[PDB]
Amino acid sequence: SKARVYADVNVLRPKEYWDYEALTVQWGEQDDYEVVRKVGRGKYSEVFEGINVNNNEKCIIKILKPVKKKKIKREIKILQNLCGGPNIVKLLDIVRDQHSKTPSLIFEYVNNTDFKVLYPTLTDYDIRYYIYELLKALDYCHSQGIMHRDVKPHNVMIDHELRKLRLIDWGLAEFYHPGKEYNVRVASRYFKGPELLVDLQDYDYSLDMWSLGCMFAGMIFRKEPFFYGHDNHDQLVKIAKVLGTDGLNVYLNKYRIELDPQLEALVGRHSRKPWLKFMNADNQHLVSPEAIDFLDKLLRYDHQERLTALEAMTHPYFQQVRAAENS
């Protein structure tokens, strides 16, 4: 398998761009940045709103839990490479505690509203708008030879007053090299592509497009998360019970992939459930034929079939957002 677009980005660029292990970090001054309050946590970091004491400007301070050199350089190099791109979080500085060597990444501040309370208040137009801005970020990172590999609402910071969006946490991100076999233990469960769940390692940017489809289905149908699996086997089961097993079987044979016998047993046999079956009274003002056509074009087993970010941005679903932006 290879990506249908941007396959050659890292091939044409100098080795320094993608050879992240050759990076030598340029540490800033820890004392420039003070923690104001904790705003988040995860497996790999704690996150705080802070202040730059020099200019009194707000920032985000991401304090990293103990991390391998190879891995931190990967996140830093990716951040540096993408800094300035549309709707990409801006890494401002990198600093470390002198005693413990605990590193902190310093970002532009974004005045985020919790997706769990934000999303239910979004208008149909709002959803179109924010999904479009998120697509800008993904087309950009893909065009620069990077897969994000952890698209989910938790990684999309939305300042809803300034109508602004940032794709954050490039901790799981990777350079795309044609034919490279990648680790499948990426993304977060509810957003993992079938490729991950069936051990197809030679995946590409299209992975992010499945995750985006899952986020989108969550929004229009008001079903958070959309595919609610308990473990990675059950995740494939949940998907199979919507998309049906025939399409799964065609996918598997195309890539010459066999399911673990135990997984095959769990998946069983299932017919396709039309998207309209998820419509109900709560969500109804959100679920037009344009919404559905677009969602259907994202949520495909076959990664090679899904819309590219560039394509998605042109889908008629977003025609009002483009018209407004053109002005």
Ligand SMILES: Brc1c(Br)c(Br)c2c(Br)n[nH]c2c1Br
């Ligand atoms: Br970077 C970054 C930014 Br910007 C924001 Br705002 C938040 C929040 Br709010 N939680 N975690 C965050 C991370 Br990581």
